[PDB]
Symmetry: none
Subunit: 73 residues, 9 copies
């Protein structure tokens, strides 16, 4: 009687996520012109004038690997 | 009696989520103009004037693989 | 009677997430102009004028690896 | 037996190439006004405003004279 | 037997290449005004404003004379 | 037997290349004004304003004279 | 041939006013209000301009008579 | 040939005013208000400009009479 | 040939004002207000300008009479 138990694992488990490997080449500009006599912002206002913005959230992207190996004679 | 438990795993489990490998070449430009006497924003207002915005959310993109190798003789 | 138990594991578990390997080549510029006589921002106001922004949040991206190995005669 | 080998060359072989003998009198005596505002150029720009330009390239104009005066007696 | 080998070359072989003998009299006597504002350029800019420019290239203009006078007797 | 070998070469092989004998009289006597404001350049700029420029390149203009006068007797 | 010009205008004219009185004159306009907007002005050659002006004038000459004479002779 | 010009205008003219009185004159305009807005002004050749001017004038000459004479001879 | 010009304008003209009295003149304009607004100016050749001027003038000459004479002779 003999038992040979040799599972081989060469796997990869991966998460590539968010903003990866992108090229942003000479973005933006021209002219942006806001003109008034009053600007009035007064509850939960968000304003973007001529800005460039890059924003990334990754709440996810997590990995799990679980293995249970058992040998009972 | 000979038992040769030899499973082999070369698999790959991958996740690719969000903005990956993109090219943004000379984005934007021209002339943007907002001319007034009064600008009035007063409740949960979101305003974008001539701005460039890149925004990525990845709440998902998660990866999980589970395995069991029990041998009972 | 003999038992050979030699599981081989060369696997890898990875999380590449957030802002990785991106190229931002000469962003911004042009002319941004914001002219008034009165500017009035007064409750939870967020204002971006001609600014460049890169912002990354990674609440996720975590890994878990578990192996429970058991041999019983 | 008498031989008088006496050729004569009085020729002129001449080359005249490019901008030769021109008279330019008061060129560009005018008035030039450019009044541009609020422009975006997204690619290569070449501009000439009120400029005077004279270019001469002469890759040619080459000159060659070849001659042989061989005399063989007997 | 008498031989008189008496050839003559009085030639002129000449090259006149490029900008030769020109008169430029008061060029660019004018008025040039450029009044640009609020511009964006994203790639290469070449500009000449009111400039006067004279360029001569002569990669050519080369000159050759070759000649052979061999006399073989008997 | 009498042999007279008296060739005569008074020729001239000449090269006149580039900017020669030109007259420039009061060039650029004008008025140039540039009143730029608020410019953005994101790449290479070359600019000439009211400048006078004279350039002469002569990679050529070369001259060669080759000759042989061999007399062979018997 | 011979050219002869005699230019000999003669003038004995009189411009005349008699007045017994000027008075009790009341220039009392209400308050004028003027508002003007234009972004850019660009004036090339011989432009003469009034923009947004407000004028009150009270002109009360005792005479105010005008005599205007123009005499031109042009020869070539 | 011979060119002869006699330019001999003659003038005995009189501009005359009698007035018995000027007075009791009341220039009382209400308060004027002017507003003008622009960005860029550019003036080149022979430009004459008035922008946003406010004028109150009270002109009361005892005479105020005008005689204007222009005499021109041009020859070529 | 001979060119002869006799330029001989003659003038005996008289400008005359009699006024019995000047008086009791009241220039009482209300408060003027002016606001001109701009960002850039350019001026080059023969430009003349007034911007945002406020003027009150009271002119009360006993005469105020004007006699104006222009004489031009031009030869080529």
């Amino acid at each position: 009687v003999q038992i040979v138990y040799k599972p081989v694992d060469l796997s990869k488990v991966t998460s590539k996520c968010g903003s990866l490997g992108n090229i942003h080449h000479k973005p933006g500009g021209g002219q942006v012109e806001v003109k008034s006599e009053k600007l009035d912002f007064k509850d939960r206002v968000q304003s973007k004038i001529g800005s460039l913005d890059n924003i990334t959230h990754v709440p996810g992207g997590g990995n799990k690997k679980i293995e249970t190996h058992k040998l009972t004679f």
